[PDB]
Amino acid sequence: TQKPADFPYPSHFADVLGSRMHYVEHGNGDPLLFLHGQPTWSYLWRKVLPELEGKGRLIAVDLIGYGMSDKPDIPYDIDDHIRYLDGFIEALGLDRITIVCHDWGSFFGFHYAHRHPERIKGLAFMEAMLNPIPGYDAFDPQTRAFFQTLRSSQANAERMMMDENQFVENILPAMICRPLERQELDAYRAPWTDRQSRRILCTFPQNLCIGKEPASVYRMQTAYIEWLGQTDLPKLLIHAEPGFLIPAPAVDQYRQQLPNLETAFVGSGLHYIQEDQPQKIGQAIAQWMDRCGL
């Protein structure tokens, strides 16, 4: 992957399970770990990070296979992603961690926090994987037919991702309210220029929990939600209108369901809200970490 000229944070790499994972880093102190999802990378947070400079050690990591991380010769099943992100976090020896997470990055962050609660200081999340999606008819029409068709066969998934590159070229722009500049979209294309490598883009849409399927992802997500409902850890839910994974009424559900949950509304956004309201998102996290000067 060629590093985009508009990503002004330094590239570092950690050795994890015989591969290298990329992350950008800024500052010192307790870590603020930023976790992206499908089909993005740490670039997604480039305009959010400036709002949090000086609030701790910013670490925005690319999941294995994504961004500027290596693409080892592996299936990129959910277990793979779990192992490699755990390996990353261990490789850096992170503790006292504030996770800032989105989409699959929230599945992984929440599952990590569930398994290592002692290592967490706080959880900030947006357009996250919280209560499982109960079925296709309760799922947002924006993507419902897209997911059904992709999930119906490996051939369909491969056509859609490898030949048509639909997640990058179509879904991503469609789930951002403002128009992307060409070099911004090019940044999202840049890890995925090779057709065969785009097989990797199949696995997240094949594994999104819908109607308890896949069953392993349903069990893990159900289990971290049960745990989230008991944890006293400070939580921040950043939300947009109309949103996607977290529409407006679901926001209020979480205020009641999750202890010590604060919220911040950032206005118009669908799924990749960092592209619509980065400054507001960053400032929401900053204000929440500052705790009114207490």
Next chain:
Amino acid sequence: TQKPADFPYPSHFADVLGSRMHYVEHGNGDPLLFLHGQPTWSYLWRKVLPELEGKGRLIAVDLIGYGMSDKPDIPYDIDDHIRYLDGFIEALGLDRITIVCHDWGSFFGFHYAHRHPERIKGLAFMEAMLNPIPGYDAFDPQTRAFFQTLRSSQANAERMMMDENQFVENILPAMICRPLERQELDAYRAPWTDRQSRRILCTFPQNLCIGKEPASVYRMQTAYIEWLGQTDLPKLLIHAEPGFLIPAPAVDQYRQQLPNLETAFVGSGLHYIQEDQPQKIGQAIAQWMDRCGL
């Protein structure tokens, strides 16, 4: 003035300088003082207060001459409003105050807070008077025409306020996105049904600081903004899109200019944002008071 049907807080009156000032009240603890501006009254906050019950002693006051307050035979210059609101606050012996303020209520609130900082616990404000308006070119052309014409002569100000009642009849509904129900508009009309009494409505738009005019208001506002820039008191700026006195780019400036400032975006609104997003406004204040240990 008769109490509106949808204003469900009990009416009280304080004796201040030989007149009665109306206020509504709820609860106990450290006070939340709600301050309205032009051409409203405490009714403006009727749907905000329910979000804050149990968070302190809620006190929403009508400026002298406004709402259900008496209309004594006085000039109603800015100094008169200062003396009567000081007299109100003293009459109730309010201390450890969280001021929640809007438009001219913010001018009076901030001027009080600047002179008596030891009486203040926090400041929550929206569509407020912070940096003076730099010139008439800060308004869109319709609004600029309104102010210019009103300010050009006493006869124009009297026509517009006394004969046309334009602040109630036009500006008010124009600066709320949703349509007002008939009883809501009637509530705003009700203190101003008398033509002679509407002379009072001239003073605020004649004294709004625009391009350093008038000089008294420029001095006082410049002084309290300097003070706001230094105090660590908790502050909350609630804002809407596109807003009016505080448009989006100003919000961002205040984020950096004023210490310990939290922001809360409430979505669509112009000036009288209480009428568009009262629940969100109230909830934003509630969350910020909890964060701030208020």
